[PDB]
Design a protein around this motif. Structure first.
Motif, PDB file in Angstrom:
ATOM      1  N   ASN A 249      53.643  46.671  35.594  1.00 31.98           N
ATOM      2  CA  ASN A 249      54.579  47.253  36.548  1.00 31.98           C
ATOM      3  C   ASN A 249      54.915  46.285  37.681  1.00 31.98           C
ATOM      4  OD1 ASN A 249      54.205  49.549  34.933  1.00 31.98           O
ATOM      5  ND2 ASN A 249      52.626  50.364  36.304  1.00 31.98           N
ATOM      6  N   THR A 250      55.000  44.989  37.370  1.00 33.03           N
ATOM      7  CA  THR A 250      55.476  44.026  38.356  1.00 33.03           C
ATOM      8  C   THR A 250      56.983  44.130  38.564  1.00 33.03           C
ATOM      9  OG1 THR A 250      55.477  41.682  38.970  1.00 33.03           O
ATOM     10  CG2 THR A 250      55.798  42.221  36.644  1.00 33.03           C
ATOM     11  N   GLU A 251      57.700  44.754  37.631  1.00 32.75           N
ATOM     12  CA  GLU A 251      59.111  45.072  37.805  1.00 32.75           C
ATOM     13  C   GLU A 251      59.324  46.299  38.679  1.00 32.75           C
TER      14      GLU A 251
ATOM     15  N   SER B  47      52.749  40.934  46.969  1.00 31.84           N
ATOM     16  CA  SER B  47      52.493  40.997  45.544  1.00 31.84           C
ATOM     17  C   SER B  47      52.330  42.448  45.111  1.00 31.84           C
ATOM     18  CB  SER B  47      51.239  40.204  45.185  1.00 31.84           C
ATOM     19  OG  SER B  47      51.159  39.006  45.934  1.00 31.84           O
ATOM     20  N   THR B  48      52.533  42.684  43.814  1.00 34.68           N
ATOM     21  CA  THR B  48      52.248  44.003  43.259  1.00 34.68           C
ATOM     22  C   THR B  48      50.796  44.384  43.507  1.00 34.68           C
ATOM     23  OG1 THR B  48      53.866  43.495  41.526  1.00 34.68           O
ATOM     24  CG2 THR B  48      52.517  45.472  41.242  1.00 34.68           C
ATOM     25  N   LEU B  49      49.884  43.430  43.341  1.00 35.76           N
ATOM     26  CA  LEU B  49      48.467  43.606  43.634  1.00 35.76           C
ATOM     27  C   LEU B  49      48.047  42.586  44.683  1.00 35.76           C
ATOM     28  CD1 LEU B  49      45.531  44.567  43.186  1.00 35.76           C
ATOM     29  CD2 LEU B  49      45.422  43.088  41.172  1.00 35.76           C
TER      30      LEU B  49
ATOM     31  N   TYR C 194      53.698  31.362  42.003  1.00 42.34           N
ATOM     32  CA  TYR C 194      52.684  32.184  41.348  1.00 42.34           C
ATOM     33  C   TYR C 194      52.402  33.403  42.220  1.00 42.34           C
ATOM     34  CZ  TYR C 194      51.562  28.625  37.825  1.00 42.34           C
ATOM     35  OH  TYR C 194      51.613  27.736  36.776  1.00 42.34           O
ATOM     36  N   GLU C 195      52.772  34.583  41.734  1.00 43.71           N
ATOM     37  CA  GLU C 195      52.400  35.804  42.430  1.00 43.71           C
ATOM     38  C   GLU C 195      50.907  36.071  42.244  1.00 43.71           C
ATOM     39  OE1 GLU C 195      55.039  39.379  42.065  1.00 43.71           O
ATOM     40  OE2 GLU C 195      53.140  40.454  41.839  1.00 43.71           O
ATOM     41  N   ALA C 196      50.325  36.788  43.203  1.00 49.96           N
ATOM     42  CA  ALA C 196      48.905  37.109  43.144  1.00 49.96           C
ATOM     43  C   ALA C 196      48.588  37.921  41.893  1.00 49.96           C
ATOM     44  CB  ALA C 196      48.482  37.873  44.399  1.00 49.96           C
TER      45      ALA C 196
HETATM   46 CA   LIG Z   1      55.698  41.770  41.743  1.00 50.51          CA
END
Ligand SMILES: [Ca+2]
Ligand SMILES: [Ca+2]
Ligand SMILES: [Ca+2]
Ligand SMILES: [Ca+2]
Lengths: 347, 347
Positions: free
Chosen positions: A274-276, A226-228, A196-198
């Motif tokens: 925008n996690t990609e 993480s992205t965030l 699980y990403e943040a």
């Molecule tokens: Ca990400």
């Protein structure tokens, strides 16, 4: 019990040297060693260290029965002990639990030192046996979560999982279940590890069994950022180093105020889109969690923090730009954020 | 800006005496004076004060541009200045903004000192002109809230309201509106003052216009203690003194964990039922807000704080009893709390 808890003035921090460092190590469960250069001759540097010593002295008192020791290794008078103990980063705290060593790189306040060391004292793997305990996992939204479904704790696959848990202790939590009934609630098979990403609702599954101790490490190494990311005091400096080309995206939002309550969910949706984009590191800074840096942020950036704020901070040039906002006007949507992000790739 | 914020070692705390106390007063907007007895000859008491001085020195650095001063009045070397300035409680901090004086009685950590003094710097009356601002008021659930609807700020009735706001600054927030449209959302007429008790949905209206400066005070004096109170670091000691016959009801619940999330709403319902019981003071202690007292509570009461806890603490006898609970079993309902409260009036 009856004695009210105050700092008693008793010195506890140990002057580590070559004679006692072994005895000191075999004495406490977890030993925290501050690797410091000798403070300068002047009265101001002496007082900077005078506070560092005390901030530790307060933590040594709180975690005395909890078997946590504190020591000061001098980079010159204890240069031998530091060489053997592998102490490189000067003016930094090293934490020793068993064999894994931790280069502590958070804020140096007695509050954060203790919570971090308390989280060091527990076990790396946090098992789940109930629904009340499984509900807690589902509430984790502010950091990297990891889940691993094993048949038994005595199994060999779960034995390499606790060994892969110590390398990241305690910055990212490693859970483990031995119930097949909850394995269906998490879309996780036998020996199937989910990641699980943040701030990411939909997780990302990891290769099926088997997974070696070296295997679990390298996946987190690629996905540690993480992205965030929420800025946490226990790691606020390692997080601030990890930027994208000297550029951080920083969001000032209080989790309690309603203005910020929607500002965080407006933000978390942007990272879901925008996690990609691996080049996108955005950092949420809860102003209720850093009360000593508030007057410095308001002065460096010319903002009011009672109102939520967002902008782009250049680490290389030490420059920043902040989205001008009106309190009466509606809180800008996620479309207005990326439209203002268009002015990020322009220069 | 570019300089990273650390304690620079510069001494800022002023040795107040009879020569400079006037100049010092007319220098800073808010002056914080620690009224202390001279520390004892021994090395331990010297270090207890050594930390108190530093905890202030860190706050003096944070609030330098914010016009906040810090001073140490010695109960013996500055006995004259303390007599004139009205300094009675030894080993305690007094805060001076304008003419009203504050006997600070919270925790003595640099975090809490600064947030408290920042809340001192703002105005006592916090006006509302928007719905985004009116939504914040509706979110206040952890302390005493007060609302006053006035026609204009220049009005005489609102002029006695800001004067009745300074006497309780900043422990309980005083808001004021000049919009008639929001006055209907709060069931408040012109010059009608509503009073929201902590954790109480349905408020309690105060006598209609006019309301003198002396009038507003005496109502809060009778209702300062809520049936349920959140333990806040800025006032944790004044709250702990205010018990019922040496008996406190204390709830250990983390606001973040889901186990505690329902435990707080299960608790807030109990106070809603027995708000007609003025002999009922219950105190909620967020363990995430007092990380330095966690190992001492777990040892004094023989509990685990990861799981929510509740019991009765005798201040006079220094005894406590705690509801034994099972983590797998369902979180006891509000009926099981009062059924266990039956064993409070038995002895
Ligand atoms: Ca990400
Ligand atoms: Ca040494
Ligand atoms: Ca003096
Ligand atoms: Ca009441």
């Amino acid at each position: 019990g009856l004695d009210f808890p105050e700092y008693d003035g008793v010195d506890r921090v140990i002057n580590v040297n070559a004679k006692n460092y072994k005895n000191v190590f075999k004495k406490y469960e977890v030993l925290a060693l501050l690797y410091h250069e000798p403070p300068e001759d002047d009265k101001a540097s002496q007082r900077q260290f005078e506070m560092e010593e005390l901030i530790l002295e307060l933590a040594a008192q709180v975690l005395e029965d909890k078997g946590v020791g504190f020591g000061l290794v001098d980079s010159e008078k204890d240069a031998a002990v530091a060489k053997k103990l592998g102490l490189t980063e000067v003016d930094s705290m090293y934490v020793f639990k068993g064999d894994e060593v931790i280069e502590y790189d958070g804020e140096f306040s007695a509050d954060t030192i203790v919570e971090f060391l308390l989280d060091v004292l527990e076990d790396p793997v946090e098992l789940i046996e109930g629904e009340r305990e499984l509900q807690a996992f589902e509430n984790i939204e502010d950091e990297i979560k990891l889940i691993g479904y094993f048949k038994s704790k005595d199994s060999e696959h779960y034995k390499a999982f606790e060994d892969a848990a110590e390398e990241f202790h305690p910055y990212i939590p490693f859970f483990a279940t031995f119930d097949s009934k909850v394995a269906k609630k998490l879309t996780l098979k036998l020996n199937e590890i989910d990641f699980y990403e943040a701030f990411m609702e939909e997780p990302v599954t990891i290769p099926g069994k088997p997974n070696s101790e070296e295997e679990i490490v390298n996946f987190v190494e690629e996905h540690r950022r993480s992205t965030l990311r929420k800025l946490k005091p226990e790691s606020m400096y390692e997080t601030w180093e990890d930027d994208m080309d000297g550029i951080h995206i920083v969001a000032f939002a209080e989790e309690a105020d309603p203005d910020g309550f929607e500002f965080l969910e407006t933000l978390k949706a942007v990272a879901q889109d925008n996690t990609e984009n691996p080049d996108l590191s955005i950092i949420w800074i809860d102003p209720d969690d850093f009360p000593l840096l508030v007057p410095y942020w308001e002065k460096t950036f010319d903002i009011d923090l009672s109102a939520p704020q967002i902008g782009v901070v250049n680490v290389t040039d030490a420059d920043s730009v902040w989205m001008e906002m009106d309190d009466e006007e509606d809180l800008p949507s996620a479309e207005e954020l990326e439209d203002w992000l268009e002015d990020v790739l322009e220069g």
